[PDB]
Design a binder for these strands. Structure first.
Ligand SMILES: [Mg+2]
Ligand SMILES: [Mg+2]
Ligand SMILES: [Mg+2]
Ligand SMILES: [Mg+2]
Ligand SMILES: [Mg+2]
Ligand SMILES: [Mg+2]
Ligand SMILES: [Mg+2]
Ligand SMILES: [Mg+2]
Ligand SMILES: [Mg+2]
Ligand SMILES: [Mg+2]
Ligand SMILES: [Mg+2]
Ligand SMILES: [Mg+2]
Ligand SMILES: [Mg+2]
Ligand SMILES: [Mg+2]
Ligand SMILES: [Mg+2]
Ligand SMILES: [Mg+2]
Ligand SMILES: [Mg+2]
Ligand SMILES: [Mg+2]
Ligand SMILES: [Mg+2]
Ligand SMILES: [Mg+2]
Ligand SMILES: [Mg+2]
Ligand SMILES: [Mg+2]
Ligand SMILES: [Mg+2]
Ligand SMILES: [Mg+2]
Ligand SMILES: [Mg+2]
Ligand SMILES: [Mg+2]
Ligand SMILES: [Mg+2]
Ligand SMILES: [Mg+2]
Ligand SMILES: [Mg+2]
Ligand SMILES: [Mg+2]
Ligand SMILES: [Mg+2]
Ligand SMILES: [Mg+2]
Ligand SMILES: [Mg+2]
Ligand SMILES: [Mg+2]
Ligand SMILES: [Mg+2]
Ligand SMILES: [Mg+2]
Ligand SMILES: [Mg+2]
Ligand SMILES: [Mg+2]
Ligand SMILES: [Mg+2]
Ligand SMILES: [Mg+2]
Ligand SMILES: [Mg+2]
Ligand SMILES: [Mg+2]
Ligand SMILES: [Mg+2]
Ligand SMILES: [Mg+2]
Ligand SMILES: [Mg+2]
Ligand SMILES: [Mg+2]
Lengths: 183, 197, 156, 111, 106, 127
RNA sequence: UUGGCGGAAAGGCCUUGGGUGCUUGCUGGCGAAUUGCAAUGUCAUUUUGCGUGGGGAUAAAUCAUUUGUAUACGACUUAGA
RNA sequence: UGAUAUGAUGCCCUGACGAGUAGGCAGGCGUGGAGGUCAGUGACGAAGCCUAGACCGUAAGGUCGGGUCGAACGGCCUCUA
RNA sequence: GCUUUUAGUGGGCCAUUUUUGGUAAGCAGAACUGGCGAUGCGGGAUGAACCGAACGUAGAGUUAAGGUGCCGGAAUACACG
């Protein structure tokens, strides 16, 4: 418990986590974001296609010197990629949230992914040998992932304030005469 | 005074017309300038041709695009004189410049709209007689402006229509004059006369 | 203690005002304002209305009337610095006006006395206005500045 | 500096308006004749006009009279200086030196 | 009639300023039809409004007003100096402004 | 209810923040004065931030007064609070930050009895 | 509603005929207040959204696949009920 | 200095003056520990931390609210590094 | 008027006038004063040293040197060439 900020209604939601996972943080950030807000079913089908190289993942923040592909057009993007490992780890967590929704007895057809957040797990050091007897760090960049699915619901109703109006003697005068004068 | 002021550039001196247009803009006055090709510059044609070629050699050495742009059209030669009188890199300046339109010839709706003059930029009032001066259209054409014939053509056509318009009006004001004078010597007339009308 | 005590406290005795010398002398009005003179109202509810000047009250205001039957303005208080005094005048000499003072207008719909007072003053004024042609029409028209009007030039 | 010959008029208005005395230093405004009589009394001079008289006639006690008055503090001229540049001599179209009786027009605009 | 107007038109020109420094406490106003300092002496002390619009209704109107007065004349051409209760926003250089006829001395 | 005072004039209300406190995180906003040789701030070049100086000092009459007109006085308990018994037009009690909730109900109560003003009555109120 | 004109960015101008509202050309009847001595005292035109019902209309582009007159990747150029 | 009211380094009247590196001096702000005191604050929440919320000071800084927290801590006169 | 004690400094540079060396130098070296260095503010577009003017926080007025076709506050002012 204690995820990142959510505006949702917990009664109609289910959630999932994984921590300390060895997956590129940068990569799964871009892939998590590609699913964000999506209808859960459409998202699962989407991810499957990414794996098939039928569609791709828009790389929006960490993209610099990535390649270009026609598969970014869909998203209005030249730079996109097909990060297999990120996808598989996410759909694992997607699959978990689905189960929990079932167990809670939530309608599985109303489900969209309302919250999906990745950030940085502690790193993992390994080392490499560099010319002239030198050593450098070689490091894993693991992620924490969390997502939340919610039952979709209809509109807002209204429920607003009355906006109390305060007008002067000369201001309330014109009003009283306005109806005196005309309709 | 008016929402829009249309200036007929014919016979006006560039820098002095520019100087008064710039100020009006910054004071919130919309201006459209017409017949820019009929504009004047002091000094004989050759001096001002030479001055243009002076301006023509300036360019960014590594890329001629980033460098200064040379617009050949009369309206644009004008806009340059004007834009230099505005602080055009400020919001306030860009605001004032959007209140402006310059045109070669007199294109639609302005052709049927009245246009005015600026006595302090007027060549015939300003230049001492005998001094040599330059027409913007001829200058532009020598530096590459392509449209002088097309404009002169369309103008000659526009000028024929406007002549009929004028003739019909001059005739109508002849009736109105005759009617006005048949009312003269009546009571209401003599009474107005007393009050200065 | 969270904070120490001061060693000294201010006295809570209020002093008395010094004995001020500023007398209220009367306000002499600008010579263009004399009773019977038509005023142009520059502001307020009745702004732009042309109205007749009647009496200078004790609170410095001007007692005016439309007449109500002409332009719809009743017997009323108006502030002398919000008015343009014209040069056109009616003789006011058949108009009582004695009755009307500051207390008359104290706030405390329309009292019948007010409604009768209005009829009695206006009939006198109307009697006088009919004398010069077009004046009543003038009095029923709103003043406004047209294009090219320059107040610092215009004679009123 | 600029200087010249002051008229009775401008001496009079110099003292009535910007005239102050030096009393245990402390630059005291004049404003009542007792202030003068108190400090200049031993020389004669019990009024503000007694002072003025001592100045303009350059009396026997002029030194004590004059030193009694704090240096006058004048504003800039309200007309302006009349010249395009001040630091030429008066004769050369400038403001400095002895402009003689023209000093009154200047000082009155500075007072 | 068609014309209801009780004020003279004007333009917010500048703040009081040097070449390189301005003074938001003073605004320079161009009054229509006033071409000389003498003409402009008529308007000194007249009250000025700058009227504008806003999205939030406040006291019941979507129209707001900044009030000021004409203070001195400015230069030879009939421009006028004026101060306002709060200084004018400076996006209004070139905006229209209303000079009234009160307080009246006529 | 406060002793009458001249209109309170603050004279510079903006906070004096350290030069470059906005440039680098390592530099706190707390005022500190530039000692640099070339520094534009120390040299008062037109366009830069202004530094504290004694000219800004508040009028002796209204100095220390709050908007209401009372000087504020820190209060731990009733005994402290009661030192204001004879000056209610001058000082107001501000209840100390570490006073317990139940104790605050007692100080407020006695405050009311004595007519002594309290600046943070809503503190720790169970509502 | 009639007839005609305008392509420089015409997108507006002129004309015919009946209907209709107003007319301060002139002369009448009624109304106005208490918005309280001023407080812009609110009358303009921008874009958009949500339902209604009066006409009107019933596509394409992209991914993938494919050609090589094209190409580092994108892009280009072909092809596909 | 005159008690019977509260600061004598105080209170009241008055005049003049105000640039600043290196540098001198002065009056103040803040910290760890020490003597004294307020029979100071606190598990009914000490300290700490967060907070384009509030208030006092020209400033160093001080005070409060709210959140988080869990065992100690502060005002004043003095001492000390 | 008089006494004691102690910091920093002991690379300086510029302008008018006097002036030495050098063809000369934004070069090198003296004289008197005023400056920059240590100093912001208005003017000279720009600039250590020029012109004006030396700085507590502010309100109103007036000016300096310099400006007032437009950039830009301020006469597309008057007058003789
Ligand atoms: Mg975690
Ligand atoms: Mg980053
Ligand atoms: Mg990055
Ligand atoms: Mg690449
Ligand atoms: Mg790159
Ligand atoms: Mg590469
Ligand atoms: Mg891209
Ligand atoms: Mg290697
Ligand atoms: Mg090795
Ligand atoms: Mg109405
Ligand atoms: Mg060449
Ligand atoms: Mg008296
Ligand atoms: Mg009088
Ligand atoms: Mg009527
Ligand atoms: Mg003057
Ligand atoms: Mg004069
Ligand atoms: Mg000069
Ligand atoms: Mg004076
Ligand atoms: Mg400057
Ligand atoms: Mg430092
Ligand atoms: Mg510097
Ligand atoms: Mg330096
Ligand atoms: Mg057009
Ligand atoms: Mg529809
Ligand atoms: Mg100092
Ligand atoms: Mg102190
Ligand atoms: Mg200390
Ligand atoms: Mg300590
Ligand atoms: Mg604060
Ligand atoms: Mg507070
Ligand atoms: Mg709390
Ligand atoms: Mg706590
Ligand atoms: Mg514990
Ligand atoms: Mg100590
Ligand atoms: Mg020594
Ligand atoms: Mg030594
Ligand atoms: Mg020594
Ligand atoms: Mg030594
Ligand atoms: Mg010098
Ligand atoms: Mg040398
Ligand atoms: Mg040095
Ligand atoms: Mg120095
Ligand atoms: Mg200096
Ligand atoms: Mg000199
Ligand atoms: Mg420019
Ligand atoms: Mg100007």
């Amino acid at each position: 418990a204690r995820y990142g900020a959510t505006s949702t209604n917990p009664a109609k939601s289910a959630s999932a986590r994984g921590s300390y996972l060895r997956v590129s943080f940068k990569n799964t950030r871009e892939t998590a974001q590609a699913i964000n807000g999506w209808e859960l079913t459409k998202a699962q089908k989407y991810l499957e296609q990414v794996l098939d190289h039928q569609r791709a993942i828009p790389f929006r923040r960490f993209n610099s010197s990535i390649g270009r592909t026609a598969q970014g057009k869909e998203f209005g993007v030249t730079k996109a990629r097909w990060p297999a490992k990120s996808v598989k780890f996410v759909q694992g967590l997607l699959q978990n949230a689905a189960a929990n929704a079932e167990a809670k007895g939530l309608d599985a057809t109303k489900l969209y992914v309302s919250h999906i957040q990745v950030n940085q797990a502690p790193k993992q050091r390994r080392r490499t040998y560099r010319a002239h007897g030198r050593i450098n760090k070689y490091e894993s960049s693991p992620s924490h992932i969390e997502l939340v699915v919610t039952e979709k619901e209809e509109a807002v109703a209204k429920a607003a304030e009355k906006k109390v109006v305060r007008l002067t003697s000369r201001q309330r005068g014109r009003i009283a005469a306005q109806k005196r004068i005309a309709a | 005074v008016e929402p829009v002021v249309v200036i007929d550039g014919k016979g006006h001196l560039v820098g002095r017309l520019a100087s008064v247009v710039a100020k009006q803009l910054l004071n919130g006055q919309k201006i459209v300038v017409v017949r820019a090709e009929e504009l004047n510059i002091s000094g004989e044609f050759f001096r001002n041709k030479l001055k243009y070629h002076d301006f023509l050699r300036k360019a960014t050495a590594f890329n001629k695009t980033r460098g200064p742009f040379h617009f050949r059209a009369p309206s644009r030669i004008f806009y340059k004189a004007l834009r230099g009188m505005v602080s055009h890199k400020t919001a306030r300046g860009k605001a004032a410049l959007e209140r402006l339109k310059v045109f070669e010839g007199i294109p639609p709706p302005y052709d049927k709209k009245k246009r005015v003059v600026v006595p302090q930029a007027l060549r015939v009032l300003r230049l001492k007689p005998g001094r040599k001066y330059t027409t913007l259209g001829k200058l532009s054409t020598s530096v590459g402006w392509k449209y002088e014939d097309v404009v002169a053509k369309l103008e000659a056509k526009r000028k024929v229509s406007s002549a009929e318009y004028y003739a019909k009006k001059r005739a109508f004001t002849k009736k109105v004059a005759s009617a006005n004078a048949t009312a003269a010597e009546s009571d209401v007339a003599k009474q107005l006369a007393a009050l200065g009308y | 203690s969270a904070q120490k005590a001061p060693k000294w406290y201010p006295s809570e005795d209020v002093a008395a005002l010094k004995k001020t010398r500023k007398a209220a002398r009367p306000q002499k009005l600008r010579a263009s304002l004399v009773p019977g003179t038509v005023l142009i109202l520059l502001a307020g509810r009745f702004r732009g209305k042309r109205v007749v000047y009647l009496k200078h009250l004790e609170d410095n205001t001007l007692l005016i009337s439309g007449p109500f039957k002409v332009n719809g303005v009743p017997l009323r208080r108006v502030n002398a610095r919000y008015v343009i005094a014209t040069s056109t005048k009616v003789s006011v000499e058949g108009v009582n006006v004695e009755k009307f003072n500051v207390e008359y207008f104290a706030k405390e719909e329309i009292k019948a006395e007010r409604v009768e007072d209005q009829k009695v003053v206006d009939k006198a004024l109307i009697a006088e206005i009919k004398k010069t042609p077009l004046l009543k029409q003038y009095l029923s028209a709103s003043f406004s500045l047209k294009n090219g009007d320059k107040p610092h030039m215009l004679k009123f | 500096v600029a200087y010249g010959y002051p008229s009775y008029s401008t001496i009079r208005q110099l003292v009535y308006k910007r005239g102050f005395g030096k009393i245990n230093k402390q630059r005291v405004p004049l404003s009542d004749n007792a202030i003068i009589e108190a400090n200049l009394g031993k020389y004669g001079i019990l009024s503000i006009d007694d002072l003025i008289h001592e100045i303009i006639t350059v009396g026997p006690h002029f030194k004590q009279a004059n030193n009694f008055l704090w240096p006058f503090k004048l504003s800039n001229p309200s007309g302006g200086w009349g010249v395009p540049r001040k630091f030429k001599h008066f004769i050369q179209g400038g403001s400095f030196g002895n402009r003689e009786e023209f000093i009154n027009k200047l000082v009155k605009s500075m007072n | 009639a068609e014309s209801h107007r009780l004020y003279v038109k004007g333009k917010h020109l500048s703040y009081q300023r040097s070449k390189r420094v301005n003074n938001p406490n003073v605004s320079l106003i161009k009054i229509e039809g006033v071409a000389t300092p003498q003409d402009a002496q008529f308007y000194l002390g007249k009250r000025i409004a700058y009227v504008y619009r806003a999205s939030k209704e406040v006291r019941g109107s979507k129209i707001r007003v900044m009030w000021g007065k004409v203070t001195r004349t400015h230069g030879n051409s009939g421009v006028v100096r004026a101060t306002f209760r709060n200084n004018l926003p400076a996006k209004t250089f070139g905006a229209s402004v209303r000079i009234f006829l009160y307080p009246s001395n006529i | 209810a406060s002793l009458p005072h001249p209109k309170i004039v603050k004279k510079h209300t903006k906070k004096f923040k350290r030069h470059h406190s906005d440039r680098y995180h390592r530099v706190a906003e707390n005022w500190r004065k530039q000692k640099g040789i070339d520094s534009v701030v120390r040299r008062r070049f037109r366009g830069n931030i202004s530094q504290p100086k004694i000219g800004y000092g508040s009028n002796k009459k209204t100095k220390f007064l709050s908007p209401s007109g009372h000087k504020t006085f820190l209060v731990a308990n009733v005994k402290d609070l009661e030192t204001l018994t004879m000056h209610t037009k001058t000082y107001a009690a501000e209840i100390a930050h570490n006073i317990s909730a139940k104790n605050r109900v007692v100080i407020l109560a006695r405050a009311k009895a004595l007519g002594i003003k309290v600046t943070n009555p809503k503190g720790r109120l169970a509502l």
